[PDB]
Amino acid sequence: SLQATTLIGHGVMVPGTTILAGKGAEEGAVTSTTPFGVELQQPADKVTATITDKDGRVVRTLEIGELRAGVHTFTWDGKQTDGTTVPNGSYNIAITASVAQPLQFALVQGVTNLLDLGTYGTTTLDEVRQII
Template identity: 40%
Template sequence: MTSTIASSVLSTMNSSSETSESSSSSADALQDEFLTLLTTQLQNQDPTDPLDNSEMVTQLAQISTISSIENVTTTLEGISGQISAAETLQASALVGNGVLIEGNSIQVADGVATTFGVTLGSDADSVTVTVKDSSGSVVATLDVGDMSAGTQALYWDGVQDDGSTAADGSYSFSVSASSDSTAVTATALKYALVTGVTTDSSSQLALDLGGVNDNVGLSDIKLVL
């Protein structure tokens, strides 16, 4: 699949270097203007009433401070631009890949169910997945057994408890986990396909999931399949 990166994302990457050059030029121009004014004042000062040295030193210090602040700003903008570029490259590498995000749906097509998953808050010695159809009826119960803390992918072969193959469509699932009969936090994860890279309403990097799911950020990806 061809990687899709929105033009707004590429524009953001290219603008970082232009912003840095603009800030640097602004600081240089400010220093040049001040030195020009200072030279003019010195050349035209009244010998009986020369410029106050302390005032001149204060002005020089102020200019130096402003220049330093602009240099720091330029450096931070450069770092921010590099981070944005790195995130864009990382996101574009996900295009065409399946990922797991928070959600509790499973899609079945031609008897094949999409991968799903779970994030456990701690180790569990008993994990059970309950699959329901669109009417809310339980169609399959999966005894996963023990699982370690963290995120793991899970699979359903599409076979229902009565031995028949699940019909095509959308199903929901829930995960219950425990350790020594004490409940363990379990967050359900659903499958999504990354189809492109774009930006959201706040101009933040976002992954396009093909319209089947809402766009998400990199931090929303719990596992890359």
């Protein structure tokens, strides 16, 4: 209970592929995206990430590179392969390495112990790879 409860209000990286893109409501707001990650059981020589929009169109392919085993997180700049910035909305990442567990950002909204992640549903504490 103590360990679950102090996560409320923090972000967690959990299995999933979702990235959210958007702008703040303030003047001058630049598009930002919620972090993504990958868990590797073995170290990786090359790491590639493909990002699709809701229609499933590839808007960017990322070359991540060499990564040691374990948990890693990244933030996409929200720009397409042609330099333009993507509309506000949901995007999905697919990651392959040479098994890869993709990680997505979720906000902890409460507890039930189970973490309530809102839209993402629930997850147990052990499925949390990183707290932010």
